[PDB]
Amino acid sequence: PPGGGEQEPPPPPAPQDVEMKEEAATGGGSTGEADGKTAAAAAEHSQRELDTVTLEDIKEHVKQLEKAVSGKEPRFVLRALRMLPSTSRRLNHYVLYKAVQGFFTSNNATRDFLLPFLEEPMDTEADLQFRPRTGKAASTPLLPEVEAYLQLLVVIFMMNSKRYKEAQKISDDLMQKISTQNRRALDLVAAKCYYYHARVYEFLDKLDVVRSFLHARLRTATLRHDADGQATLLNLLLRNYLHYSLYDQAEKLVSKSVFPEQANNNEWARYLYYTGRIKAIQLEYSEARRTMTNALRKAPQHTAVGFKQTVHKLLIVVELLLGEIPDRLQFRQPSLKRSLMPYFLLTQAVRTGNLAKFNQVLDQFGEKFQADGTYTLIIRLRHNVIKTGVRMISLSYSRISLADIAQKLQLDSPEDAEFIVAKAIRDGVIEASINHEKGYVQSKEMIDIYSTREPQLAFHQRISFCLDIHNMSVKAMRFP
Amino acid sequence: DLYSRYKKLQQELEFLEVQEEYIKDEQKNLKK
Amino acid sequence: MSEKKQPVDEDNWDDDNVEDDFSNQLRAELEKHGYKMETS
Amino acid sequence: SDVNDDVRRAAVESLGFILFRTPEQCPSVVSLLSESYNPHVRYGAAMALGICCAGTGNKEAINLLEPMTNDPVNYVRQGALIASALI
Amino acid sequence: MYEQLKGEWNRKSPNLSKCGEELGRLKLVLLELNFLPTTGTKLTKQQLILARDILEIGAQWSILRKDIPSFERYMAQLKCYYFDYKEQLPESAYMHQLLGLNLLFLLSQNRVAEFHTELERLPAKDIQTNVYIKHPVSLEQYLMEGSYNKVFLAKGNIPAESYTFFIDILLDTIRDEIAGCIEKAYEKILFTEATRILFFNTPKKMTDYAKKRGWVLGPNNYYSFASQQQKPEDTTIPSTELAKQVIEYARQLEMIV
Amino acid sequence: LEEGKAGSGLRQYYLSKIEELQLIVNDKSQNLRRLQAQRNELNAKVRL
Amino acid sequence: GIISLLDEDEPQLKEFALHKLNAVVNDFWAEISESVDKIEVLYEDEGFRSRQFAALVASKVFYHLGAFEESLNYALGAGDLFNVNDNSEYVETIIAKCIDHYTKQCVENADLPEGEKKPIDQRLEGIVNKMFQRCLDDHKYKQAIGIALETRRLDVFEKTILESNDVPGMLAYSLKLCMSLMQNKQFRNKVLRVLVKIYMNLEKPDFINVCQCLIFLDDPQAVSDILEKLVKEDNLLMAYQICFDLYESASQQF
C-alpha cells in the first residue's frame, strides 16, 4: 500500500476511456458501413482487427479490476438498440455507465461470476441489428479468460462461451444475412476460439469433435463465396492432421481444393509452409523447396515470431536433401541465432565424408531432432552422405577410374563402384557414363549454352512472369 | 420484395457490362 | 502478430563465405610447404 | 470508331430516344461522353441528356449541364441552353 | 456366433471350405453391429477384439494362399480398424508383425512415396526395438546407399517366416531395373560382366533372359543391341512454337483495352 | 412451422441467389471505376 | 474400409456399405474417389434393388468435388430417397441448380416452337410442381409468381392468379412486373392474352384494363365487340371514360 498502492489510481481511468472510445467509434464506424456502402474493402474493419490481434493481447492480460474489462459486461447488460429514441435512450446510458464506473465502483468480477456476465448480456432485450457488436463483446472475454490460466471451473465457461458464439454464428449466416457480411471478422474469431478449443483439450486430451464440426462449417460454407472463410477453415482442418500421424487426409485435402487468391498476406505465409511440409514427405522435393522459399521471403516484417524461425528451419534441411548446399554461413541472423547449433553442426558433417562425427552429431542432438518435428532425416541423410562424395568427385574430376573412386570413397570394393555411379545417373545426381571395359567413367560434352536455345528458355520464363506482375499491378491500383 | 429486386440486379449487371465495354473500347481509339 | 509458434530466445563484421573454416588440417602453411619439399 | 463529326453526333444523340423510359442511365453515360476532346461529341451528349429526361427535377443533369454552358465553343453552349430549357 | 475361432491354423490349412466358412463368419460379425460410431461401452469392444482377430488370421491366410489383391484388402480392413477416433482395445502382440507385412509389401510394390508417408505412426518403434519394422527401414537404407550385396546377404535373414512372397517381388523389382540399367548404348560384354552385374554361376536365370530378351551367349560373348539417333538440325520445331511465344508477348503488351 | 421450416425451402432460393448478383456488381464496380479514370487520364492528355 | 467391402458381390454386403456411405460422407472425402469409380461402372448393371443409395452418395461426393451436372444426373437417377428430402444444406443447393438447369432449357426451347425440342424428364418436373405446392402452402405467393414467369409456363401462371389470395393486388403486382420490365416480346403477348382471360371470367365487368391491354396488342375487332356490349347492357358511364383513354393512349391506325 505505501509503495505500489500509489501506483494503483493512475492505471484505470485514462486507458479505460481511450480504449472504449476507439472500439465504440469503430463500432459506430462499422455500423454506418454496414448500413450503407457495404464495399468496405479498405475500411477500418481490417485495422481494428489488426488492433485486436496486437494491442489487446499485449496491453491487458487479466480481467483488469477497477472495472475495465470486468465492468464492460454490466455496462452492456442493458442494451436494446432498435428505434431511434430507443438508441438515444441507450446513448444516454452509455454516458451514465461510464460516468459511474469512472467516478466510483459499479460491479466487480471475482473470477466465478461469468455466468451472470454472459447470459443476461445476451439477454435483456438484445437484438440482431448490431451483430459485430455482439460478436466482439462475446469474443472480448475469451482472451483474458484463457490468459489467466487458473483452471477452476473455467473450461466449461469456455465451452459454454464457444457453443453460444457458434450458435450466434449460425444465426447470422442463415437468418437475415442481407448486407451484414461479418466473415472478415468472424473468421479470425473462429480461428482464435479453436486455438483455445484445441489447447485446453491439449492440456488433457485429443480433439475430434472440433474437426467434425469444422467439416460441417466448411460444408455450409464454400457454396456462397470464398473470401478468406474457406482459407482459414482449410488450415485449421490441415494443421490438426499434420499435428497427428496421418498424412493421407491432408494429402487428399491439398489435392483438390482451388483457391480464392485472396487471403491478405497472412494465410499465404502459413499455407505455403504447410503444403511445403506435405510435398516434402511424399518426396516431391524441387516443388517443395521453392514454395518453402516463397513463404519465407513473403513477410520478413516479423520480430522473433517463431514461424519465420521454423520455415527457415525446414528450408535448410530440404536443401541438404537435394545436395543444393544451403548457405554455409549466411543463416546466422540476429533474429534466431540459437536454433542453428543443431543444424550448423549438422551441415558440417554432411558436407564432409565423415561418419563417426556425423553419428556423434546425430546421437547427441537426437532429442532436439525429435522435439522440433524433423526426425524424418534418419532415413534420408544416409542417402545424402554417400551421394555427396560421388557428386563432389564428378564435379571436380572429368575422367576417373572405378578403382580410383572406390579407394577415394573409403569403400574397399571396386565391384560396386559401377553400382554407385549407375544409381547416380539413374537418380540424376550427375550426367555421366561408364564404359564397362576397363573402368572409364567419362564426363559430359563440351558445355555450350548460348548456341542451343538455352538463354531463350530462361528468358521466356522471365518475360511472361514479369508482365503478369504488371497485369496484377494494373488491376489493383485504381479506386474512387 | 424478393423477386422485384432480383430482376433489377440483373439490369444493373447488364448495363454495367455494357458500360465497361465501350469505355474500354474508347481507350483504343483515343490512343489513335 | 503471433503465428501460433514459439521463440527460443572477420568474425563479427557479419562476414563469411562458403568454406572459411572447413579446412583445419595443419592450416599454418609453414609445415604444409615444408612437408611437401622434403618428400621430394 | 467513325471519323465524321455528324454521324458521331447522331450516334450520341440517339441515347435519349432509346433510354427515355429509364432516367437512371442517361446521366451515367453522358457524363463521361460530355468531356470528350471534340465539341461535337460534347454537343450531342448535351442534347441527349435533355431529350432523355423530359420533365423531372434531376439536379444531376443540371449539375452536368452547368459546365456545358461555360465552354469557349459557341454552339456547344447553344445545346446546353436548350437542354437546360427542356429539363 | 463363435463359429470356428481357431480351426486348422496352427499346423496346416489345405482346405478351401475354411475360406467360405470364414467368409460366412465375416458376414455374421458385420450383420451383428457396425463399427462406425465406436465411442465406448466395452461390451461392443468385445466384438471389436474378435473382428480384428478374425481378419489378422484372414491376413495370414491371404499371404499363404498367394493372393495379392486380398492381402491389401484385409490389411485395409485392419488399418481402418486401427484408425479409431477413441482408440482403446489394448495391445495385441500381432500388431508389430502386421505392420512389417504391410510395409514390406509396400516396399515391394515400388512405392517409395507411400513408404515414407506411413512412417509417422510409430514414435520410437524404429530404432530402439521392433525388428519387424527395423528390417524394412534397414533394407530401404541399403537401396539408397547403393549396396546390392548387403540386400541379398540379409535376404536370408528374417525374424518370423521366410518372407517368401515379399522377397520374390523384391527379387523381381530389382532385376528389371538392373536389366533397365544395362540396356543402354552398350554393344557387347563377356560372361564375367554378367557374373558381376547379374549373379549366379550359370543358372536357368540367364536362360530366362535369353528366352525372353536377347543377351545371346555365342562364343563366350553376349550381344546387347544398341543405337543412337541425331537431332541438332531442327530449327523448325523452335520456329513454329517460338513464333507463338513472340506473338503472345505482343498480344499481352496491350489488351487490357 | 409455416415459415420456419420453409425459410430454407423456397425463400432461400432467392436470398442465396441475389448475393452473386450483389457481389459481382460490387466487384465490377471496382473494375468499372478503373476503366473510367484511365480514360480520364488519356482524354486529359489529348485535349491539352 | 468401405472400398474393401465394395470389391465383393453380395447384396447383403452392399447394403452395409451404403449404410456407411451416406452416414459419414461429410467426413470421408475424395479418398472415396476410387470407390465411386467402382460405383459408376456397377451402376450400369443394377442387379440388386439398392441402386438408389448408390446414386445418392454419387451425388454427395460429386458435390464435394464440385461436379454439378453429374450431381444432377444422379439426383434425378436417385428417385424416392432424393424426393423425400427437403431439410438439408445439401438438398437446397442441388434443386437450385435443377431449376437453373430447367429455366435455361425452356428459354432455349422457347426459341424453337417448331419441332426439334429437347426430351424432358418427368423426374425433373416432378420436383418443379412439388416445390410449387410448397410455394402454395407457404402462403407467400410472390415466391410462387416469380418462378412461374421464369419457367415460361402459362397454366401455372393462370392457376396462381385464379386463386383467391389477393385477387386484384397480386394480379396488379403481376401486371406491374410485366409492363415495367420486359426484354423478350415472344411471350409478351402470351402473358398479355392470359391477363385478359382472368378479367373476363372473374366476377364483374372491369373493362378498363382489357382495353388497356388490347391497345398494347393489335386487336381492332376485339375492342369494337366489347364496346358494342357496353352500349347493349346500358352502360354508358365507363364507356364514355374508356373511349377517351383509347383516344389519349393510341394515336393512329388503330
PDB file of N, CA, C and O in Angstrom, chain A residues 25-62:
ATOM      1  N   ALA A  25     -16.250   4.082 -31.565  1.00  0.00           N
ATOM      2  CA  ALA A  25     -16.255   4.842 -32.810  1.00  0.00           C
ATOM      3  C   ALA A  25     -16.059   3.927 -34.010  1.00  0.00           C
ATOM      4  O   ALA A  25     -16.702   4.112 -35.048  1.00  0.00           O
ATOM      5  N   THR A  26     -15.168   2.942 -33.888  1.00  0.00           N
ATOM      6  CA  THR A  26     -15.038   1.936 -34.933  1.00  0.00           C
ATOM      7  C   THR A  26     -16.270   1.041 -34.970  1.00  0.00           C
ATOM      8  O   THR A  26     -16.749   0.679 -36.050  1.00  0.00           O
ATOM      9  N   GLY A  27     -16.807   0.696 -33.795  1.00  0.00           N
ATOM     10  CA  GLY A  27     -18.081   0.001 -33.745  1.00  0.00           C
ATOM     11  C   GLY A  27     -19.224   0.839 -34.275  1.00  0.00           C
ATOM     12  O   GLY A  27     -20.163   0.307 -34.875  1.00  0.00           O
ATOM     13  N   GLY A  28     -19.162   2.156 -34.071  1.00  0.00           N
ATOM     14  CA  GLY A  28     -20.063   3.045 -34.778  1.00  0.00           C
ATOM     15  C   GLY A  28     -19.685   3.208 -36.234  1.00  0.00           C
ATOM     16  O   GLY A  28     -20.554   3.396 -37.088  1.00  0.00           O
ATOM     17  N   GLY A  29     -18.385   3.139 -36.539  1.00  0.00           N
ATOM     18  CA  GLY A  29     -17.955   3.171 -37.926  1.00  0.00           C
ATOM     19  C   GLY A  29     -18.256   1.885 -38.663  1.00  0.00           C
ATOM     20  O   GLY A  29     -18.497   1.903 -39.873  1.00  0.00           O
ATOM     21  N   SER A  30     -18.246   0.754 -37.952  1.00  0.00           N
ATOM     22  CA  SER A  30     -18.701  -0.493 -38.551  1.00  0.00           C
ATOM     23  C   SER A  30     -20.201  -0.472 -38.788  1.00  0.00           C
ATOM     24  O   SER A  30     -20.691  -1.140 -39.705  1.00  0.00           O
ATOM     25  N   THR A  31     -20.937   0.287 -37.974  1.00  0.00           N
ATOM     26  CA  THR A  31     -22.387   0.340 -38.104  1.00  0.00           C
ATOM     27  C   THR A  31     -22.806   1.112 -39.349  1.00  0.00           C
ATOM     28  O   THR A  31     -23.638   0.635 -40.130  1.00  0.00           O
ATOM     29  N   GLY A  32     -22.230   2.299 -39.554  1.00  0.00           N
ATOM     30  CA  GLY A  32     -22.549   3.081 -40.736  1.00  0.00           C
ATOM     31  C   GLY A  32     -22.071   2.443 -42.024  1.00  0.00           C
ATOM     32  O   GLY A  32     -22.680   2.638 -43.078  1.00  0.00           O
ATOM     33  N   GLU A  33     -20.987   1.666 -41.958  1.00  0.00           N
ATOM     34  CA  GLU A  33     -20.539   0.930 -43.134  1.00  0.00           C
ATOM     35  C   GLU A  33     -21.394  -0.303 -43.387  1.00  0.00           C
ATOM     36  O   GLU A  33     -21.550  -0.718 -44.540  1.00  0.00           O
ATOM     37  N   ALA A  34     -21.957  -0.898 -42.333  1.00  0.00           N
ATOM     38  CA  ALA A  34     -22.906  -1.988 -42.532  1.00  0.00           C
ATOM     39  C   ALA A  34     -24.244  -1.462 -43.030  1.00  0.00           C
ATOM     40  O   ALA A  34     -24.927  -2.128 -43.816  1.00  0.00           O
ATOM     41  N   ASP A  35     -24.633  -0.268 -42.582  1.00  0.00           N
ATOM     42  CA  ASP A  35     -25.902   0.309 -43.007  1.00  0.00           C
ATOM     43  C   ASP A  35     -25.840   0.837 -44.431  1.00  0.00           C
ATOM     44  O   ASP A  35     -26.826   0.732 -45.170  1.00  0.00           O
ATOM     45  N   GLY A  36     -24.705   1.397 -44.831  1.00  0.00           N
ATOM     46  CA  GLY A  36     -24.554   1.934 -46.167  1.00  0.00           C
ATOM     47  C   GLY A  36     -23.121   1.853 -46.641  1.00  0.00           C
ATOM     48  O   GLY A  36     -22.200   1.946 -45.824  1.00  0.00           O
ATOM     49  N   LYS A  37     -22.936   1.698 -47.957  1.00  0.00           N
ATOM     50  CA  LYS A  37     -21.640   1.461 -48.600  1.00  0.00           C
ATOM     51  C   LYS A  37     -20.956   0.239 -47.975  1.00  0.00           C
ATOM     52  O   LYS A  37     -19.967   0.328 -47.241  1.00  0.00           O
ATOM     53  N   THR A  38     -21.566  -0.916 -48.244  1.00  0.00           N
ATOM     54  CA  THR A  38     -21.034  -2.190 -47.772  1.00  0.00           C
ATOM     55  C   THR A  38     -19.730  -2.586 -48.456  1.00  0.00           C
ATOM     56  O   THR A  38     -19.107  -3.564 -48.032  1.00  0.00           O
ATOM     57  N   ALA A  39     -19.302  -1.859 -49.493  1.00  0.00           N
ATOM     58  CA  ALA A  39     -17.976  -2.030 -50.082  1.00  0.00           C
ATOM     59  C   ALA A  39     -16.963  -1.456 -49.098  1.00  0.00           C
ATOM     60  O   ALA A  39     -16.571  -0.288 -49.153  1.00  0.00           O
ATOM     61  N   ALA A  40     -16.540  -2.308 -48.173  1.00  0.00           N
ATOM     62  CA  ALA A  40     -15.687  -1.943 -47.054  1.00  0.00           C
ATOM     63  C   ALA A  40     -14.331  -2.620 -47.181  1.00  0.00           C
ATOM     64  O   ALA A  40     -13.795  -3.168 -46.214  1.00  0.00           O
ATOM     65  N   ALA A  41     -13.770  -2.600 -48.396  1.00  0.00           N
ATOM     66  CA  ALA A  41     -12.544  -3.342 -48.673  1.00  0.00           C
ATOM     67  C   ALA A  41     -11.326  -2.700 -48.024  1.00  0.00           C
ATOM     68  O   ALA A  41     -10.458  -3.408 -47.502  1.00  0.00           O
ATOM     69  N   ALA A  42     -11.243  -1.372 -48.041  1.00  0.00           N
ATOM     70  CA  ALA A  42     -10.146  -0.646 -47.419  1.00  0.00           C
ATOM     71  C   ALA A  42     -10.593   0.053 -46.140  1.00  0.00           C
ATOM     72  O   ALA A  42      -9.953   1.004 -45.686  1.00  0.00           O
ATOM     73  N   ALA A  43     -11.682  -0.419 -45.544  1.00  0.00           N
ATOM     74  CA  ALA A  43     -12.270   0.231 -44.386  1.00  0.00           C
ATOM     75  C   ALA A  43     -11.518  -0.168 -43.118  1.00  0.00           C
ATOM     76  O   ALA A  43     -10.574  -0.962 -43.148  1.00  0.00           O
ATOM     77  N   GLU A  44     -11.955   0.364 -41.980  1.00  0.00           N
ATOM     78  CA  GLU A  44     -11.277   0.156 -40.707  1.00  0.00           C
ATOM     79  C   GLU A  44     -11.608  -1.181 -40.057  1.00  0.00           C
ATOM     80  O   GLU A  44     -11.186  -1.405 -38.921  1.00  0.00           O
ATOM     81  N   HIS A  45     -12.356  -2.056 -40.741  1.00  0.00           N
ATOM     82  CA  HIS A  45     -12.606  -3.399 -40.228  1.00  0.00           C
ATOM     83  C   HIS A  45     -11.313  -4.192 -40.127  1.00  0.00           C
ATOM     84  O   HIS A  45     -11.138  -4.994 -39.204  1.00  0.00           O
ATOM     85  N   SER A  46     -10.399  -3.973 -41.070  1.00  0.00           N
ATOM     86  CA  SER A  46      -9.136  -4.696 -41.070  1.00  0.00           C
ATOM     87  C   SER A  46      -8.206  -4.176 -39.982  1.00  0.00           C
ATOM     88  O   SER A  46      -7.662  -4.958 -39.196  1.00  0.00           O
ATOM     89  N   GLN A  47      -8.019  -2.851 -39.921  1.00  0.00           N
ATOM     90  CA  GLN A  47      -7.072  -2.268 -38.973  1.00  0.00           C
ATOM     91  C   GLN A  47      -7.542  -2.431 -37.532  1.00  0.00           C
ATOM     92  O   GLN A  47      -6.718  -2.580 -36.622  1.00  0.00           O
ATOM     93  N   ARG A  48      -8.859  -2.402 -37.301  1.00  0.00           N
ATOM     94  CA  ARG A  48      -9.369  -2.735 -35.974  1.00  0.00           C
ATOM     95  C   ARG A  48      -9.138  -4.205 -35.663  1.00  0.00           C
ATOM     96  O   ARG A  48      -8.823  -4.562 -34.522  1.00  0.00           O
ATOM     97  N   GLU A  49      -9.257  -5.071 -36.668  1.00  0.00           N
ATOM     98  CA  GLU A  49      -8.890  -6.464 -36.459  1.00  0.00           C
ATOM     99  C   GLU A  49      -7.379  -6.619 -36.321  1.00  0.00           C
ATOM    100  O   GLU A  49      -6.910  -7.499 -35.590  1.00  0.00           O
ATOM    101  N   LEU A  50      -6.604  -5.750 -36.975  1.00  0.00           N
ATOM    102  CA  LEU A  50      -5.167  -5.723 -36.723  1.00  0.00           C
ATOM    103  C   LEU A  50      -4.855  -5.199 -35.326  1.00  0.00           C
ATOM    104  O   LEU A  50      -3.809  -5.537 -34.761  1.00  0.00           O
ATOM    105  N   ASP A  51      -5.742  -4.382 -34.753  1.00  0.00           N
ATOM    106  CA  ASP A  51      -5.575  -3.974 -33.364  1.00  0.00           C
ATOM    107  C   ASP A  51      -5.849  -5.137 -32.417  1.00  0.00           C
ATOM    108  O   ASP A  51      -5.060  -5.398 -31.500  1.00  0.00           O
ATOM    109  N   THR A  52      -6.953  -5.863 -32.642  1.00  0.00           N
ATOM    110  CA  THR A  52      -7.402  -6.891 -31.706  1.00  0.00           C
ATOM    111  C   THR A  52      -6.454  -8.077 -31.626  1.00  0.00           C
ATOM    112  O   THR A  52      -6.442  -8.781 -30.611  1.00  0.00           O
ATOM    113  N   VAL A  53      -5.655  -8.307 -32.661  1.00  0.00           N
ATOM    114  CA  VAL A  53      -4.592  -9.293 -32.559  1.00  0.00           C
ATOM    115  C   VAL A  53      -3.444  -8.751 -31.723  1.00  0.00           C
ATOM    116  O   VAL A  53      -2.971  -9.402 -30.785  1.00  0.00           O
ATOM    117  N   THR A  54      -3.000  -7.533 -32.033  1.00  0.00           N
ATOM    118  CA  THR A  54      -1.788  -6.994 -31.415  1.00  0.00           C
ATOM    119  C   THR A  54      -2.061  -6.421 -30.026  1.00  0.00           C
ATOM    120  O   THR A  54      -1.563  -6.942 -29.026  1.00  0.00           O
ATOM    121  N   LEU A  55      -2.894  -5.377 -29.947  1.00  0.00           N
ATOM    122  CA  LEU A  55      -2.878  -4.491 -28.781  1.00  0.00           C
ATOM    123  C   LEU A  55      -3.545  -5.132 -27.570  1.00  0.00           C
ATOM    124  O   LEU A  55      -2.982  -5.134 -26.472  1.00  0.00           O
ATOM    125  N   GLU A  56      -4.741  -5.691 -27.750  1.00  0.00           N
ATOM    126  CA  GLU A  56      -5.495  -6.243 -26.630  1.00  0.00           C
ATOM    127  C   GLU A  56      -4.889  -7.512 -26.052  1.00  0.00           C
ATOM    128  O   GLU A  56      -5.309  -7.939 -24.973  1.00  0.00           O
ATOM    129  N   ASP A  57      -3.909  -8.107 -26.726  1.00  0.00           N
ATOM    130  CA  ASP A  57      -3.193  -9.248 -26.186  1.00  0.00           C
ATOM    131  C   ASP A  57      -1.886  -8.871 -25.508  1.00  0.00           C
ATOM    132  O   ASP A  57      -1.395  -9.644 -24.680  1.00  0.00           O
ATOM    133  N   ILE A  58      -1.317  -7.712 -25.827  1.00  0.00           N
ATOM    134  CA  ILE A  58      -0.066  -7.283 -25.218  1.00  0.00           C
ATOM    135  C   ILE A  58      -0.263  -6.173 -24.196  1.00  0.00           C
ATOM    136  O   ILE A  58       0.677  -5.875 -23.445  1.00  0.00           O
ATOM    137  N   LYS A  59      -1.439  -5.544 -24.147  1.00  0.00           N
ATOM    138  CA  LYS A  59      -1.683  -4.498 -23.160  1.00  0.00           C
ATOM    139  C   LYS A  59      -2.288  -5.075 -21.888  1.00  0.00           C
ATOM    140  O   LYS A  59      -1.725  -4.935 -20.797  1.00  0.00           O
ATOM    141  N   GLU A  60      -3.433  -5.735 -22.011  1.00  0.00           N
ATOM    142  CA  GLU A  60      -4.105  -6.354 -20.880  1.00  0.00           C
ATOM    143  C   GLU A  60      -4.021  -7.871 -20.991  1.00  0.00           C
ATOM    144  O   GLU A  60      -4.029  -8.435 -22.089  1.00  0.00           O
ATOM    145  N   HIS A  61      -3.920  -8.528 -19.835  1.00  0.00           N
ATOM    146  CA  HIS A  61      -3.812  -9.982 -19.788  1.00  0.00           C
ATOM    147  C   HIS A  61      -4.729 -10.570 -18.722  1.00  0.00           C
ATOM    148  O   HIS A  61      -5.006 -11.774 -18.723  1.00  0.00           O
ATOM    149  N   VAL A  62      -5.192  -9.732 -17.802  1.00  0.00           N
ATOM    150  CA  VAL A  62      -6.132 -10.137 -16.770  1.00  0.00           C
ATOM    151  C   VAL A  62      -7.440  -9.385 -17.045  1.00  0.00           C
ATOM    152  O   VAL A  62      -7.532  -8.583 -17.973  1.00  0.00           O
TER     153      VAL A  62
END
